[PDB]
Amino acid sequence: SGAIYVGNYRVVNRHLATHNDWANLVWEDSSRDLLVSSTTAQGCDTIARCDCQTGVYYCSSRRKHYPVSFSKPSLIFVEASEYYPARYQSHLMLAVGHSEPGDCGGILRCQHGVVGIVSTGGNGLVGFADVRDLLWLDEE
């Protein structure tokens, strides 16, 4: 589990969105596994607006932040899970690292801010949904 809190937005994995998220919906995209809801309180996270390909992510199943090198956002084939059939997920970046069921939502960050959140795992790989192109997260 996990979310990004920027401005008056909460960014979560679409597959983990709550009823309150859906009832206060700003934007959702199943192809990216992302959903953004509105919040009453202002958040403290800042979104990275950069071209970093190295950063650090939080892995809840290890209680640890790991440094990783990750691929550029791309259209990657993801196997069927209990949340989606086997399909192409867009704006996904892969790295070598631990990601098991429950790690979705952990933040990937660089020196500039938040880059994305854990969205896929298994096989010693971890995939992150990028958020750096969602410029509107920085404004009202």
Ligand X SMILES: NC(=O)[C@H]1CCCN(C(=O)C2CCSCC2)C1
- Answer for which of 34, 76, 89, 134 binds ligand X (CB under 6 A) is 89
**Catalytic annotation on 91?**
no
Which residues lie near Zn ion (CB under 5 A)? 48, 50, 52, 110, 112
Distances (CA, A) of 45 to 1, 14, 100, 116: 16, 19, 24, 11
Supply the minimum distance, in Å, between the C-beta of residue 80 and ligand X. 9
Compute the Cα dihedral for 81, 110, 112, 6 and give only its sign. positive
Helix (H, G, I), strand (E, B) or coil at 20: helix
**Catalytic annotation on 44?**
no
Binding flag, residue 106, ligand X (CB under 6 A): no
Binding flag, residue 83, ligand X (CB under 6 A): yes
Cβ atoms 137, 48 nearer than 8 A = no
What letter would DSSP give residue 71? P
Binding flag, residue 62, ligand X (CB under 6 A): no
**Three-class secondary structure assignment of 50-62:** CCCCEEEEEECCC
Binding flag, residue 128, ligand X (CB under 6 A): no
Supply the minimum distance, in Å, between the C-beta of residue 26 and ligand X. 20
**Has 50 been labeled as part of a binding site?**
yes
DSSP-assigned beta bridge partners for residue 92: 74, 129
Binding flag, residue 121, ligand X (CB under 6 A): yes
Q: Which residues are catalytic?
A: 15, 33, 104
As annotated, the binding site for Zn(2+) includes: 50, 52, 110, 112
